[model samples]
Target: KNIESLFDYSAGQFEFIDHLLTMGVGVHFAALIFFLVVSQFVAPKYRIATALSCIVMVSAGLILNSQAVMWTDAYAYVDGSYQLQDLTFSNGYRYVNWMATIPCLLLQLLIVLNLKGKELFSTATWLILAAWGMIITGYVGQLYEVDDIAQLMIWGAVSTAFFVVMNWIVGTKIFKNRATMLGGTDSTITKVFWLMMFAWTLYPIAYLVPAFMNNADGVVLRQLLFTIADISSKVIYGLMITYIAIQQSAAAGYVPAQQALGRI
Candidate 1:
């Protein structure tokens, strides 16, 4: 924590990561932009899941973060000493406290939970619901500080990997296949990939511009650059998460791109 606090709220625009804790805000905003772009292009069948995942993640994040405002509101009385016990599993968030996921989990029982046909796809839905249910439950319960690594794993690893699954299906089956089979102006999906790369490239330049970050500003250009660092840290990761889903779906269904690519 030796780093100098380089961010200033007394400014014009929220150019980048001027605030570290507000990362959730940047994430939600960028997620919306990225989701909108893909929604216009991804097939209708998968659009609902894509949109739903984004919505659920953002909503849950916002709900958990709302506690900050609550604590801020109570600063005069408590002097703002936050603690893990403030939000624990026992009397946690409304979602878990009332056990909302129980009803949803039961609904999955109606479908038999098979891994083939429509049942196959429904798995992601059920899993997503459960995952979101658990995550938000913890956040509202404020269980993060009790074990940072555990909380990070559920949010950073499990939920995110599910998103990668969705991306594979969309990338291989939908976008890449459509590019091959349905030839048109849209065949330039490779360009879309490159467009993402360009966005990736922008980060380095942004960093060199007097990076006044709350973290290591000189190391990366505040938030925009650091955001890219973490997002891309997953390798081939970007806002367009549907790529993995498309790729996997294409391979499973044996789309031409899959066969031609050989690893399909």
Candidate 2:
């Protein structure tokens, strides 16, 4: 059975998942507005980091909203509980969202890091490729999540390989460049980098939920894990990047950012 069909949920279980999906939508949209409003405080050069954050938030919000609608549509109110409907609910949109937004997220790092010339070109190329590889392979594995355990494990392993490559690049390339950043931003960037790495680990754990606990409770747990991972990896990650940008802007004598910091 596929993921949706595995659940013949009680009212509480159905409502819990529904609330979480909607909550994801709300959080992303709120972050989107926050990013747009605060982007103005930074210098023009650094605003791209916040702008990228806005893009990530917008894409995630829309996808999550759609997922919420799909969740409702996929269930029928039975005598006492929610039953699966003929309408199939898929998490494929999340993969699409990740494919589109993960690059933007990684690009934000490059922007804040201020890579240029050959260094920028090389780092961006490999980083985006690894991101795509990770998502694509993971999506392929997820397709088998309900059917073939062998295929799922194989593809999941491949996806994890790409993830490992991403971390390597971050460690070798991105972290190596931290010394070039402003004094205050350097330590913040290091922490954010670790946060990003830690947040990303949740995705694989969520992905494997079907293997360990393929039941109604597992569905709820998976959604919870995904939501937490999304918020930390995307929204919180974006906020930190924006903070670094603002700090850099102030250090660069952007009067508005300095004034804003002083007011804070």
Candidate 3:
């Protein structure tokens, strides 16, 4: 009774969203395990960075994901359209996770690419700040209660522009400057960048599903797509990072001491 009265969703629809939130925890749990395995392949020097990044990813997967579901209001179709019957506030927990993870990812890449000097520091700062710019605007956009899509699109443009700039910086500075290897010239790194760019584009579209499409299914699809993106961006991307480390270590003839793997 309270739930139906509180928001526009039926009991079934509310339960479905609840179930999705429950499964979101499992998704992050799996990601945590996957990260643990991949972290083994990263070299000793880079292991710390990998460990921290993985922890943050799981933190996002488990904590932030659940919090958003519990904290945020669910929407329903009224008169052939979706409307937000709000009894909540938005601190952008979901976007907060992205803001945290995106910068960590840039740092992980910096370590992978062995960036140095003023260029490295400057680039890292810019990417972190740029990520914040993107998510802050996105958070504000998500906070809206009604069909105020113009706000979403306005910030979407600002954030998309920053994303383009970040990728350009990575392509020119990091990928171009990556260490040459034996089997290939770090071709996989560039491929990963392209993969990330493609997957990242799907994000704004996913978020727009409920707002633009006006269906409960859109809500489910939004969760599913964002979950997929999270896995792609963090786990798959981290695997490639370790792959670079392993291949580069072999090419450099540098055998990591067992202590590097924390075997002691």
Candidate 4:
């Protein structure tokens, strides 16, 4: 009775817009359109992997970040008090970008710098990279959870499995070569490492938001900065992935063929 009488009909006449917004139809329809557009880019070989990763990111935003069931003016909790709620993507996404992209790029430097003669072409690096990505993902998931201890433990185990397998195969030349070997020339490792280190120096900053200026100012100051960081970090990550793919692409006359070409 009081609810119905409180509404003033003369205040607005954008009835359709009001209903659409309230029903969340706009967001759902927008997401559908976005999926169609994104699908067009995902069809290509080089783009498919990254595209899939992007879809995962989107799912996180829509589902875990903010999945409100219904909207109402406002209401008191079961205990007769108003409850406040806010779901944010900033910290969650920031951590993921860090654990997955930043470390992968740095580790790529490690793989390239330590390449060995007779080592297989990046077999070891690839394994470690994949493992490290999974571990970060699992750990980040746990940190983001509110109080789900069981889920955290499960992800912990999954992360450990990948971690062990990856470290088990450190060098590209794990066997048959005695010294372990990469199919490419000895210079491959050192060249790759240096290039990656340069790339990494430019990557982590991508994940930080301009708003970090406010961790001192207040949490809100980080809002815009965080977005900037995520984009920058992602660019570095994507570039590193491409560079790794290229390391084996031209393999015809590999770099200055030498043995155990390493450096500080």
TM-score of 4: 0.30
- TM-scores for every predicted model: 0.36, 0.97, 0.77, 0.30
* Candidate order (lDDT): 2, 3, 1, 4
Q: What are the C-alpha RMSDs, in order, of all predicted structures?
A: 12.6, 1.1, 5.4, 14.0
Worst 10 residues of 1 by lDDT: 1-10
> Candidate 2 or 3, higher lDDT?
2
lDDT of 1 by residue, 117-220 (tens): 67545644654555455445434323332334344344434434543443343334335334332223244344444454454344334322332332333422
Candidate 2: worst-modelled 10 consecutive residues by lDDT:
1-10
**Best candidate per lDDT, number?**
2
Evaluated with TM-score, which candidate comes out highest? Answer: 2
Among all windows of 10 consecutive residues in model 4, the one with the lowest summed lDDT is: 255-264
lDDT of 1 at 46: 42
Q: Over the stretch 20-70, how does candidate 2's per-residue lDDT look in tens digits?
A: 989998999999889898898989887988999999998888888898899
Residue-by-residue lDDT tens digits, candidate 4, 47-89: 3333433443444334322322221232223343322233222
